[PDB]
Enzyme design. Structure first.
Site, mmCIF file in Angstrom:
data_model
loop_
_atom_site.group_PDB
_atom_site.id
_atom_site.type_symbol
_atom_site.label_atom_id
_atom_site.label_comp_id
_atom_site.label_asym_id
_atom_site.label_seq_id
_atom_site.Cartn_x
_atom_site.Cartn_y
_atom_site.Cartn_z
ATOM 1 N N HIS A 14 0.850 -1.180 0.000
ATOM 2 C CA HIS A 14 0.000 0.000 0.000
ATOM 3 C C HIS A 14 0.897 1.245 0.000
ATOM 4 O O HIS A 14 1.877 1.271 0.725
ATOM 5 C CB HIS A 14 -0.886 0.018 1.214
ATOM 6 C CG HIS A 14 -1.890 1.103 1.183
ATOM 7 N ND1 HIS A 14 -1.592 2.407 1.559
ATOM 8 C CD2 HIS A 14 -3.187 1.112 0.777
ATOM 9 C CE1 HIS A 14 -2.660 3.163 1.368
ATOM 10 N NE2 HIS A 14 -3.654 2.392 0.957
ATOM 11 N N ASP A 16 0.954 4.242 1.238
ATOM 12 C CA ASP A 16 1.211 4.852 2.536
ATOM 13 C C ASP A 16 2.150 3.978 3.364
ATOM 14 O O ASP A 16 3.062 4.475 4.033
ATOM 15 C CB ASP A 16 -0.080 5.065 3.283
ATOM 16 C CG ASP A 16 -0.941 6.183 2.689
ATOM 17 O OD1 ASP A 16 -0.405 7.149 2.093
ATOM 18 O OD2 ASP A 16 -2.207 6.107 2.847
ATOM 19 N N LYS A 17 1.916 2.669 3.326
ATOM 20 C CA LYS A 17 2.746 1.767 4.083
ATOM 21 C C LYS A 17 4.151 1.595 3.526
ATOM 22 O O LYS A 17 5.109 1.395 4.267
ATOM 23 C CB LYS A 17 2.057 0.438 4.254
ATOM 24 C CG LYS A 17 1.929 0.037 5.697
ATOM 25 C CD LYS A 17 1.042 1.021 6.444
ATOM 26 C CE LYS A 17 1.137 0.824 7.919
ATOM 27 N NZ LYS A 17 2.263 1.533 8.578
ATOM 28 N N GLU A 42 10.508 11.778 6.459
ATOM 29 C CA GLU A 42 9.219 11.573 5.819
ATOM 30 C C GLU A 42 9.489 11.013 4.430
ATOM 31 O O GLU A 42 10.445 11.457 3.754
ATOM 32 C CB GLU A 42 8.515 12.913 5.576
ATOM 33 C CG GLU A 42 8.289 13.774 6.794
ATOM 34 C CD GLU A 42 7.548 13.120 7.942
ATOM 35 O OE1 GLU A 42 7.095 11.939 7.835
ATOM 36 O OE2 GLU A 42 7.397 13.813 8.994
ATOM 37 N N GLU A 55 14.694 15.898 8.407
ATOM 38 C CA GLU A 55 15.796 16.425 9.139
ATOM 39 C C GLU A 55 16.486 15.282 9.868
ATOM 40 O O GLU A 55 15.860 14.492 10.522
ATOM 41 C CB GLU A 55 15.321 17.463 10.171
ATOM 42 C CG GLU A 55 14.465 18.563 9.572
ATOM 43 C CD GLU A 55 13.002 18.183 9.364
ATOM 44 O OE1 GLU A 55 12.398 17.409 10.160
ATOM 45 O OE2 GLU A 55 12.418 18.613 8.338
ATOM 46 N N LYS A 166 -5.364 -4.737 1.047
ATOM 47 C CA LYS A 166 -6.149 -4.062 2.087
ATOM 48 C C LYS A 166 -7.150 -5.063 2.660
ATOM 49 O O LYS A 166 -7.734 -5.858 1.892
ATOM 50 C CB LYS A 166 -6.896 -2.884 1.462
ATOM 51 C CG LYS A 166 -7.749 -2.091 2.415
ATOM 52 C CD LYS A 166 -8.356 -0.890 1.690
ATOM 53 C CE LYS A 166 -7.481 0.336 1.782
ATOM 54 N NZ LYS A 166 -8.124 1.479 1.052
ATOM 55 N N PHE A 235 -6.876 -6.785 -9.862
ATOM 56 C CA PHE A 235 -6.006 -5.840 -9.159
ATOM 57 C C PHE A 235 -4.585 -6.241 -9.567
ATOM 58 O O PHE A 235 -3.788 -6.749 -8.750
ATOM 59 C CB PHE A 235 -6.290 -6.065 -7.691
ATOM 60 C CG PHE A 235 -5.642 -5.103 -6.709
ATOM 61 C CD1 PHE A 235 -4.719 -4.135 -7.084
ATOM 62 C CD2 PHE A 235 -5.902 -5.280 -5.356
ATOM 63 C CE1 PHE A 235 -4.121 -3.322 -6.120
ATOM 64 C CE2 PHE A 235 -5.319 -4.443 -4.390
ATOM 65 C CZ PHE A 235 -4.412 -3.476 -4.781
ATOM 66 N N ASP A 243 -1.018 6.544 -7.912
ATOM 67 C CA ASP A 243 -1.500 6.722 -6.574
ATOM 68 C C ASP A 243 -0.455 7.655 -5.927
ATOM 69 O O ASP A 243 0.520 8.111 -6.574
ATOM 70 C CB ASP A 243 -1.644 5.365 -5.876
ATOM 71 C CG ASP A 243 -2.773 5.329 -4.827
ATOM 72 O OD1 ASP A 243 -3.169 6.357 -4.242
ATOM 73 O OD2 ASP A 243 -3.223 4.210 -4.552
ATOM 74 N N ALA A 244 -0.744 8.106 -4.747
ATOM 75 C CA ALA A 244 0.286 8.782 -3.961
ATOM 76 C C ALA A 244 0.157 8.339 -2.538
ATOM 77 O O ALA A 244 -0.964 8.059 -2.100
ATOM 78 C CB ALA A 244 0.143 10.261 -4.095
ATOM 79 N N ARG A 249 0.214 8.271 7.209
ATOM 80 C CA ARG A 249 -1.147 8.390 6.739
ATOM 81 C C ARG A 249 -1.952 7.126 7.070
ATOM 82 O O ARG A 249 -3.045 6.982 6.564
ATOM 83 C CB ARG A 249 -1.185 8.738 5.245
ATOM 84 C CG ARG A 249 -0.697 10.167 4.957
ATOM 85 C CD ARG A 249 -1.663 11.229 5.466
ATOM 86 N NE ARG A 249 -2.922 11.077 4.732
ATOM 87 C CZ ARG A 249 -3.248 11.717 3.605
ATOM 88 N NH1 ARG A 249 -2.480 12.660 3.080
ATOM 89 N NH2 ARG A 249 -4.382 11.433 2.987
ATOM 90 N N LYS A 250 -1.409 6.267 7.946
ATOM 91 C CA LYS A 250 -2.074 5.040 8.390
ATOM 92 C C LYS A 250 -1.977 4.916 9.890
ATOM 93 O O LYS A 250 -1.770 3.826 10.410
ATOM 94 C CB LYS A 250 -1.536 3.831 7.616
ATOM 95 C CG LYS A 250 -1.971 3.818 6.156
ATOM 96 C CD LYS A 250 -3.354 3.259 5.967
ATOM 97 C CE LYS A 250 -4.058 3.498 4.645
ATOM 98 N NZ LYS A 250 -4.207 4.954 4.446
ATOM 99 N N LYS A 270 11.025 8.326 12.935
ATOM 100 C CA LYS A 270 11.277 9.218 14.086
ATOM 101 C C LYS A 270 12.050 8.486 15.150
ATOM 102 O O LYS A 270 11.688 7.361 15.512
ATOM 103 C CB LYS A 270 9.941 9.637 14.684
ATOM 104 C CG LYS A 270 9.091 10.485 13.741
ATOM 105 C CD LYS A 270 7.806 10.910 14.430
ATOM 106 C CE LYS A 270 6.991 11.796 13.525
ATOM 107 N NZ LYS A 270 5.670 12.083 14.158
#
Ligand SMILES: Nc1ncnc2c1ncn2[C@@H]1O[C@H](CO)[C@@H](O)[C@H]1O
Ligand SMILES: Nc1ncnc2c1ncn2[C@@H]1O[C@H](CO)[C@@H](O)[C@H]1O
Ligand SMILES: [K+]
Ligand SMILES: [K+]
Ligand SMILES: [K+]
Ligand SMILES: [K+]
Ligand SMILES: [Mg+2]
Ligand SMILES: [Mg+2]
Ligand SMILES: [Mg+2]
Ligand SMILES: [Mg+2]
Lengths: 380, 374, 380, 374
Positions: A14, A16-17, A42, A55, A166, A235, A243-244, A249-250, A270
């Site tokens: 996915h 985001d993942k 990020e 950073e 998903k 699929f 997609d972006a 975002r999850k 992080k």
């Protein structure tokens, strides 16, 4: 008293993942060479591109092209036919040093236990006795279904599987004096990317028999359970193609699947000074310690911080009516057993160790090998 | 019986919020020319850079240089001294736009996603929102107002606030007693001193925003707690769309079932149906049916009407949860297409949602209670 | 027999030249730590952005953000009012390893003298006795005018100067038995970026009196010399703002200003295995050795290479009729005095030394401190 | 009396040439909708990425996803196995487009740059171009033809060639005697063997292109000299617009006064006037006035007519350089606006110029000689 509840989970492919996992691969690369690296990485994924932005102040020498590409390879994207290829995608890097205003305000010239929170914010921990992992059943099952897909894909049991997936699991619940009792699985939705060389009938059969039956306890499955397997049909292409995706975002998927509450902070990319991660991990540890300690059946823990300040600004305990002790008594117990300064949390949970890529899919909570999933024996 | 609860908010120039505002500016620009545009616009911000990424189906032709730069100018980033400048930043466009379906464009004679959305409302404020997040939002708004009117001209656009309220409870309702702790961190110029900043933040910001009854001698202030915040905006911290989803919603209160709002058109049910669920929750409280309420709406693949609705009133209603459900079903049609008509969601008002919270504001159709019949 | 000729030069702030200089700053950073680094670093500059793209295999650990930003600072862009600021611009990095197909084909497992050319191509060298630097007067004057602008800008003699500039120098020539004799400067054009706080009259006066008169020999200036100083009026904003530049887009400026010939290869961002640079430097060295040796007055040298092949494929000498020796005799002399394998050129011209940032503005040729500008004493 | 001279060319899939073709595809797309568009489009190519940068003044609305991807598809990059795929590459758009001047748009009732441009022509080929660069170009074209027709299906799009000719001279004219050396490097699949490649390159490429009279037993062949060229295109080597300016022009012969062609509209005089100077040089040779010629045209700030023209015929004319100048002035008007009318330079034909050389081709107005009166 009854209700339905649904949680989602997504596979490693996915978009985001992908971004969470890359972010944490970059974090772990830094940490392997510099345990004290400050990282805020990020990741952005879209057609043919991974971009890193953020950073980092670190003594490590990290090859970002190799780290990114190897992580994309690991996820399983190695061909145009899949929608993405680690060999030929664009990797752009915009990583700078951590702002000196931040560094000075948080960690510079301080003893480790006195390090300030890397940012303000609020964080929640949650636990529930409805599973042995002390997690909501909806999110446990959703994550396990995606993990089983990746397992069977990678070992060649179902070689037509591809990385994007998903799952959504709806469970019917009863309530019991503020606890929740899962009774049955109402609906399972599974969509998974696949090679062109397999038909839907064969996929749907495999999803029921090799994935769902391997993962979901038979007691919860019954004649009326609804199965939506490849509900949108074929699929073939997935991942970032058309997609972006972005890191963080999850966050609901990453945590309790809609249960409890969330403070809004993402985890991936992080280091431990970012309380968005370290304090949410500690608050999970607190919640799970309270439940496994038999002080309550279900519990929500809130903590909060100010940038540059070592101590929490607030701590709160909500037991849903599932304890003999008042919420004030539980809070007093928590304050006697836990020190939620990030510079103490780091030692307790071993948060300089480069294990974060493992957290980036299938949920950060509920797995036994992480230190925040080992309950603290409480004194009271 | 008392407890603490904490919520945060961020300013327009916080880098994540910059991205939410640009993503929604892009959505609005499309909707102004093409009310049926499908938009899924992600924005990324880092030193010198605005990157747009995502998928658009639309007949609009949008000038992204203009849309992005005007948004950044409006936020207040107009010089290198402030860390970011609309004049000189790099706007990278990676959006993939396609025309709508050819065959349907010529069809001149005229949602399936298993998941849940939550609405929440509380009578503790007139906004029908938690006091913690109402105050956090208003503190950021005040900073922008005083920056923009030149009262505190040392202010820059990037700000974060956090408010901890001490509450008691009364039969499931929550009653704010006092503000326990306030955090404010705001970017600033190089001339102003820390003492002067801290005094202004207390006297001209906090005391102008927080009702006096909630402030006392024991309230804790962490004002500019880092000591120095000259570097800010995207220079200091990368921003992305949809990284302030709790700021956008209920501040930790209620529940969240996942999904960000900004840069998504009204056909994304996790935006539209979240707004509807707020509308329902606020209607129940303003109607006197509940003091506090969580409205949980589940949608199923292959059903347009919700699969199920549960109403959790925390014990603050004389009526049972089942009776409230019956009132909801008789007064609301939560099919996603009916939602978009009732809340007029094709209108380009989204940029306004993208700072200071989607909920509690005085200006959106989902914040206007429906008069209920029962 | 007479003709006019014009050459151009641009200042360090011209967007193409920013890119050459950054490319060579990146090269020199690698070379400071790894003398054998393979570098092919292209730079792109546009509104608020520097992007690096290319291939590098190196043992060095280079901080690209710092190298780029410091080079932008050095050029003089530190504020929005100038059009660009090193502190707040976007720096994107897309640097990968050199392709293994290339590495294997050129340099891997070979003795240094036998290293293959890094690419095919053709290269030219040129020299002319019309100046002591053995360069065309048009391009000497154009470069010196831009250098004098940067000198006076950086030492605070004309503090209103900013980094972007362009100069064009038209010289009237006579011919003498294939040599060229500059007689007079016909036209000088100078455009230079400037602070808002100065008027055109003052700038134009300064350009004539402190720049042109400091640099151009009085003999060439006369009553009819045309001066176009700030010919387009005010020029407050320059550099990459609303412009785009790229590495290797000033190759004529970089060389002989339109004289002689060019093989098409850019110099900046490339280590010595890239014959586009090393063989053009050697061919300059050959041309200048022939002229200073008194074998001819003006000369053009061509060499060419094939990827992976150590030896030149062709060598040619064109003396414009300015020698007593035939072109075949000069070629035989060149082949007896020079070994133009890149692995030999590197030792002769010291091309692993990190001096390339110095080459990236004001011309690669004509300066005495570079080894290709020290004539070889020839045996014949 | 003999000498060597070497020129090179590159294929359509060489990464620098990919960028020239995209830059000119962008120019053409603008000109198709707006003949007065001003375009300065730079393209950058590296692994996975096409970046467009530059300034445009235009009324056109161009679909860059389409324009870029179609160009890449046409070149032949359509799978990850080949190193680049039009389907899945990242198209980043950083172009800054503005509308034309408002006031002049409503003005319904209807060049200054000190520098020089060179034109060159030689009678050694019918193309009026050096044999070295004619052969180098044609060798790349042949590779594309045999790749595209499936004769040599192991071929990929990225190719480079280089030809060294041994010449003699005759009163300033240059007479090709023989091809001394040929280099061909072309990207290829993973199955074909080196022996098979080298044989095909000699027998089906070189012998189909180079006149037999120029090939002999001593001609040196460097075919796939690196040994292995599977990685190619932008994956192997970053590309940029305007990094093959000598390939685009005369291959080292004549002279070049600076500037690249692709992605610049006809108002960039260093493109338009270079084409005119070629036209003049080719007209003089085809007119029988010169066997070989260098035409040098200088422009001055504040003069539309050239400041000066010099004609260097290398001794290949019975007429003096001054007499040829008089013929040029009586037959050509080299004001840049007259050039663009005479050569019809507002037409969108630029993409075709961007591979196989701008000069020597059978299809452009500047390659059509003018009949001279004298
Ligand atoms: N020096 C600082 N002090 C306090 N907050 C900061 C500082 N720099 C950045 N921030 C804020 O914290 C966020 C995360 O680092 C930023 O987006 C910004 O709002
Ligand atoms: N392995 C190789 N062998 C020969 N030429 C190559 C190889 N890889 C790339 N090239 C060509 O050389 C150029 C410069 O490296 C590329 O653009 C490509 O045309
Ligand atoms: K019960
Ligand atoms: K961030
Ligand atoms: K003479
Ligand atoms: K290159
Ligand atoms: Mg956060
Ligand atoms: Mg953030
Ligand atoms: Mg080259
Ligand atoms: Mg190149």
């Amino acid at each position: 008293g009854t209700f339905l509840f649904t949680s989602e989970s997504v596979g490693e492919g996915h978009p985001d993942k992908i971004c969470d996992q890359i972010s944490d691969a970059v974090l772990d690369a830094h940490l392997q060479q510099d345990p004290d690296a400050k990282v805020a990485c990020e990741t952005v994924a879209k057609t043919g591109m991974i971009l890193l932005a953020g950073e980092i102040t670190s003594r490590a020498a990290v090859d970002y092209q190799k780290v990114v590409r190897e992580a994309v390879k690991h996820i399983g994207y190695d061909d145009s036919s899949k929608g993405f290829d680690y060999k030929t995608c664009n990797v752009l890097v915009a990583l700078e040093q951590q702002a000196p205003d931040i560094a000075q305000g948080v960690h510079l010239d301080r003893n480790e236990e006195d390090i300030g929170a890397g940012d303000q914010g609020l964080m929640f921990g949650y636990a529930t006795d409805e599973t042995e992992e002390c997690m909501p059943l909806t999110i446990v099952l959703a994550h396990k279904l995606n993990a089983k897909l990746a397992e069977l894909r990678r070992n060649g049991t179902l070689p037509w599987l591809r990385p994007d997936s998903k799952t959504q699991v709806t469970v019917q619940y009863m309530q019991d004096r503020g606890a929740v009792l899962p009774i049955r699985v109402h609906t399972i939705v599974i969509s998974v990317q696949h090679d062109e060389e397999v038909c839907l009938d064969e996929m749907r059969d495999a999803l029921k028999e090799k994935v769902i039956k391997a993962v979901v306890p038979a007691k919860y499955l019954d004649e009326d359970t609804i199965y939506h397997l490849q509900p949108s049909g074929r699929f073939v292409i997935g991942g970032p193609q058309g997609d972006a995706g972005l890191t963080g975002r999850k966050i609901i998927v990453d945590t309790y699947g809609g249960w409890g509450a969330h403070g809004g902070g993402a985890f991936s990319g992080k280091d431990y000074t970012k309380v968005d991660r370290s304090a949410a991990y500690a608050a999970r540890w607190v919640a799970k310690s309270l439940v496994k300690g038999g002080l309550c059946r279900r519990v929500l823990v809130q903590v909060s911080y100010a940038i540059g300040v070592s101590h929490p600004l607030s701590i709160s305990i909500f037991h849903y009516g599932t304890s003999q002790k008042s919420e004030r008594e539980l809070l007093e117990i928590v304050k006697k057993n836990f020190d939620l300064r990030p510079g103490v949390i780091v030692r307790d949970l071993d948060l300089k160790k480069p294990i974060y890529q493992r957290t980036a899919a299938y949920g950060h909570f509920g797995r036994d090998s992480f230190p925040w999933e080992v309950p603290k024996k409480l004194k009271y």
